[PDB]
Write an enzyme that holds these catalytic residues in place. Structure first.
Site, mmCIF file in Angstrom:
data_model
loop_
_atom_site.group_PDB
_atom_site.id
_atom_site.type_symbol
_atom_site.label_atom_id
_atom_site.label_comp_id
_atom_site.label_asym_id
_atom_site.label_seq_id
_atom_site.Cartn_x
_atom_site.Cartn_y
_atom_site.Cartn_z
ATOM 1 N N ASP A 13 11.630 93.207 -13.437
ATOM 2 C CA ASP A 13 12.305 94.383 -12.898
ATOM 3 C C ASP A 13 13.611 93.987 -12.217
ATOM 4 O O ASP A 13 13.894 94.425 -11.098
ATOM 5 C CB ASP A 13 11.387 95.134 -11.922
ATOM 6 C CG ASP A 13 11.954 96.479 -11.500
ATOM 7 O OD1 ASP A 13 12.850 96.995 -12.202
ATOM 8 O OD2 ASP A 13 11.498 97.024 -10.474
ATOM 9 N N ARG B 289 19.520 97.778 -8.221
ATOM 10 C CA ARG B 289 18.800 98.356 -7.087
ATOM 11 C C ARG B 289 17.915 97.324 -6.400
ATOM 12 O O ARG B 289 17.613 97.463 -5.210
ATOM 13 C CB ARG B 289 17.957 99.550 -7.546
ATOM 14 C CG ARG B 289 16.820 99.134 -8.453
ATOM 15 C CD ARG B 289 16.028 100.260 -9.070
ATOM 16 N NE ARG B 289 15.369 99.723 -10.252
ATOM 17 C CZ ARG B 289 15.760 99.930 -11.504
ATOM 18 N NH1 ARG B 289 16.794 100.717 -11.774
ATOM 19 N NH2 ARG B 289 15.095 99.356 -12.491
ATOM 20 N N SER C 106 12.251 106.273 2.712
ATOM 21 C CA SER C 106 10.975 106.953 2.526
ATOM 22 C C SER C 106 10.887 107.373 1.061
ATOM 23 O O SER C 106 11.235 108.497 0.696
ATOM 24 C CB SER C 106 10.866 108.144 3.462
ATOM 25 O OG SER C 106 12.093 108.853 3.516
ATOM 26 N N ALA D 274 8.501 107.333 -2.753
ATOM 27 C CA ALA D 274 7.131 107.498 -3.218
ATOM 28 C C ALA D 274 6.375 106.174 -3.271
ATOM 29 O O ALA D 274 5.231 106.148 -3.738
ATOM 30 C CB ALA D 274 7.133 108.165 -4.593
ATOM 31 N N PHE D 275 6.992 105.085 -2.809
ATOM 32 C CA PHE D 275 6.368 103.772 -2.736
ATOM 33 C C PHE D 275 5.958 103.408 -1.315
ATOM 34 O O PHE D 275 5.652 102.242 -1.044
ATOM 35 C CB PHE D 275 7.328 102.717 -3.281
ATOM 36 C CG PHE D 275 8.603 102.601 -2.496
ATOM 37 C CD1 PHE D 275 9.712 103.353 -2.838
ATOM 38 C CD2 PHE D 275 8.688 101.750 -1.406
ATOM 39 C CE1 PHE D 275 10.886 103.253 -2.115
ATOM 40 C CE2 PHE D 275 9.860 101.646 -0.679
ATOM 41 C CZ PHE D 275 10.959 102.400 -1.035
ATOM 42 N N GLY D 276 5.962 104.369 -0.407
ATOM 43 C CA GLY D 276 5.796 104.124 1.008
ATOM 44 C C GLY D 276 7.068 104.419 1.773
ATOM 45 O O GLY D 276 7.933 105.183 1.338
ATOM 46 N N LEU E 79 14.420 103.187 7.025
ATOM 47 C CA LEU E 79 15.461 102.884 6.053
ATOM 48 C C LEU E 79 15.272 103.612 4.736
ATOM 49 O O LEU E 79 16.265 103.944 4.077
ATOM 50 C CB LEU E 79 15.510 101.379 5.778
ATOM 51 C CG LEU E 79 15.885 100.505 6.972
ATOM 52 C CD1 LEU E 79 15.697 99.045 6.619
ATOM 53 C CD2 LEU E 79 17.316 100.782 7.408
HETATM 54 C C1 LIG Z 1 17.166 103.464 -5.406
HETATM 55 N N1 LIG Z 1 18.601 103.198 -5.195
HETATM 56 C C2 LIG Z 1 19.039 103.827 -3.940
HETATM 57 C C3 LIG Z 1 18.986 101.761 -5.307
HETATM 58 C C4 LIG Z 1 18.821 100.983 -3.976
HETATM 59 C C5 LIG Z 1 17.462 101.123 -3.260
HETATM 60 C C6 LIG Z 1 17.214 100.425 -1.917
HETATM 61 O O1 LIG Z 1 18.084 99.756 -1.365
HETATM 62 N N2 LIG Z 1 15.962 100.619 -1.462
HETATM 63 C C7 LIG Z 1 15.528 100.177 -0.273
HETATM 64 C C8 LIG Z 1 14.485 100.915 0.274
HETATM 65 C C9 LIG Z 1 13.948 100.587 1.510
HETATM 66 C C10 LIG Z 1 14.460 99.511 2.218
HETATM 67 C C11 LIG Z 1 15.505 98.759 1.698
HETATM 68 C C12 LIG Z 1 15.964 97.735 2.440
HETATM 69 C C13 LIG Z 1 17.037 97.765 3.254
HETATM 70 C C14 LIG Z 1 17.923 98.731 3.544
HETATM 71 C C15 LIG Z 1 18.771 98.490 4.626
HETATM 72 C C16 LIG Z 1 19.732 99.414 5.021
HETATM 73 C C17 LIG Z 1 19.859 100.608 4.326
HETATM 74 C C18 LIG Z 1 19.022 100.861 3.244
HETATM 75 C C19 LIG Z 1 18.060 99.933 2.852
HETATM 76 O O2 LIG Z 1 17.154 96.605 3.807
HETATM 77 C C20 LIG Z 1 16.187 95.820 3.389
HETATM 78 N N3 LIG Z 1 15.942 94.546 3.714
HETATM 79 C C21 LIG Z 1 14.858 93.877 3.158
HETATM 80 N N4 LIG Z 1 14.065 94.590 2.270
HETATM 81 C C22 LIG Z 1 14.358 95.866 1.980
HETATM 82 N N5 LIG Z 1 13.581 96.549 1.137
HETATM 83 C C23 LIG Z 1 12.486 95.965 0.322
HETATM 84 C C24 LIG Z 1 11.843 97.112 -0.462
HETATM 85 O O3 LIG Z 1 11.685 96.743 -1.833
HETATM 86 C C25 LIG Z 1 11.460 95.306 1.037
HETATM 87 C C26 LIG Z 1 11.249 95.476 2.405
HETATM 88 C C27 LIG Z 1 10.213 94.802 3.050
HETATM 89 C C28 LIG Z 1 9.367 93.961 2.336
HETATM 90 C C29 LIG Z 1 9.565 93.793 0.973
HETATM 91 C C30 LIG Z 1 10.602 94.465 0.334
HETATM 92 C C31 LIG Z 1 15.413 96.502 2.533
HETATM 93 C C32 LIG Z 1 16.052 99.097 0.447
#
Ligand SMILES: CN(C)C/C=C/C(=O)Nc1cccc(-c2c(-c3ccccc3)oc3ncnc(N[C@H](CO)c4ccccc4)c23)c1
Length: 311
Positions: free
Chosen positions: A141, A145, A25, A27-29, A23
């Site tokens: 934070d 986003r 990639s 710089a945070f993993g 979903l």
């Molecule tokens: C930078 N801009 C683009 C603004 C929006 C940024 C954004 O959406 N980034 C993001 C990055 C990676 C995963 C996701 C993300 C998505 C997703 C689903 C479909 C399409 C795209 C994303 O579904 C998720 N469901 C739960 N946690 C998520 N992600 C957090 C990480 O914090 C997490 C996962 C697991 C455990 C803890 C937390 C995601 C969301």
């Protein structure tokens, strides 16, 4: 002395879940979408899975802090940790939010977002935040986003990296490693690295502003260095076009100098609920219903041939 934190931290086996696709990639993993199939049960649970690449020495103590707090929350408007998996590199497992972050969503659907969804999101985020305040927790934070979309009707707060706990005695938190997004930050936070539930309210104001603008970058031109000064000079983000003064004034109160005169999340819930009962009185959005003969220009005298008869 303080309330014991009796949250469970579930350990999950790598085998009981399948990564399907990446979903994100950063710089945070990287974050995968996946399926969690506990062997005991007969269920399959759509999940998101997060790991970082090498073991960065601090960063591996960072992701376990995020785990700590995600496991310590239980609210319908807050993403909860489902478990961790202790592979070569640690993995956080959480509920999949299929539509991704709200920011991308308001952008990818500008033309199809009505006032009721905007104001109902504002309610929901204030509930999530009012819950974290009840749990003595300061997000540090909040931003569009970091709000994810389960469905268009249901959003949840996430990204608890940076989040901090506060006992009954402390009312404050003094950071050191100042690498926090400047443009969502209270003044007291930028100057004195102070963080309060009321500094979260400031970031709420900026988050609301992002939504009402369908995803604009705050202070789009200006660079982080200046932000401190112009906010001190008394400048703020502009009134979004779709916003009535009623809405825009709530934002502005989130951006006061005196943090204690900003509104409480419990109040923001009330005021945005009231507004969400008559959405179009408080947000004026051209086309506020459904925009559905596919021509792609600007014409208000278009009639359909079926309604044009023999002159
Ligand atoms: C930078 N801009 C683009 C603004 C929006 C940024 C954004 O959406 N980034 C993001 C990055 C990676 C995963 C996701 C993300 C998505 C997703 C689903 C479909 C399409 C795209 C994303 O579904 C998720 N469901 C739960 N946690 C998520 N992600 C957090 C990480 O914090 C997490 C996962 C697991 C455990 C803890 C937390 C995601 C969301």
């Amino acid at each position: 002395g303080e309330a014991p934190n009796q949250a469970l931290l579930r350990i999950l086996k790598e085998t009981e879940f399948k990564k399907i696709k990446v979903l994100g990639s950063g710089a945070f993993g990287t974050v995968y979408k996946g399926l969690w199939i506990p062997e005991g049960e007969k269920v399959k649970i759509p999940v998101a899975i997060k790991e970082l690449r090498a073991t960065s020495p601090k960063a591996n103590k960072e992701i376990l802090d995020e785990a700590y707090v995600m496991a310590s929350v239980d609210n319908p408007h807050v993403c909860r940790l489902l478990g961790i998996c202790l592979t070569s590199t640690v993995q956080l497992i959480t509920q999949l939010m299929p539509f991704g972050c709200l920011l991308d969503y308001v952008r990818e659907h500008k033309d199809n977002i009505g006032s009721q969804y905007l104001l109902n999101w504002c309610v929901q985020i204030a509930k999530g935040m009012n819950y974290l305040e009840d749990r003595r927790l300061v997000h540090r934070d909040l931003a569009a986003r970091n709000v994810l979309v389960k469905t268009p009707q249901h959003v949840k707060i996430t990204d608890f990296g940076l989040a901090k706990l506060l006992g009954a005695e402390e009312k404050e938190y003094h950071a050191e490693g100042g690498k926090v997004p400047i443009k969502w930050m209270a003044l007291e936070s930028i100057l004195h690295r102070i963080y309060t539930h009321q500094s979260d309210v400031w970031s709420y104001g900026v988050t609301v502003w992002e939504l009402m603008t369908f995803g604009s970058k705050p202070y789009d031109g200006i660079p982080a260095s200046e932000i401190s000064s112009i906010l001190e000079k008394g400048e703020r983000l502009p009134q979004p076009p779709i916003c009535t003064i009623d809405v825009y004034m709530i934002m502005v109160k989130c951006w006061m100098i005196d943090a204690d005169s900003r509104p409480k999340f419990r109040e923001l819930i009330i005021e945005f609920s009231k507004m969400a009962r008559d959405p179009q009185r408080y947000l004026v959005i051209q086309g506020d219903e459904r925009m559905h003969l596919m021509d792609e220009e600007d014409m208000d005298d278009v009639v359909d041939a079926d309604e044009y008869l023999i002159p």
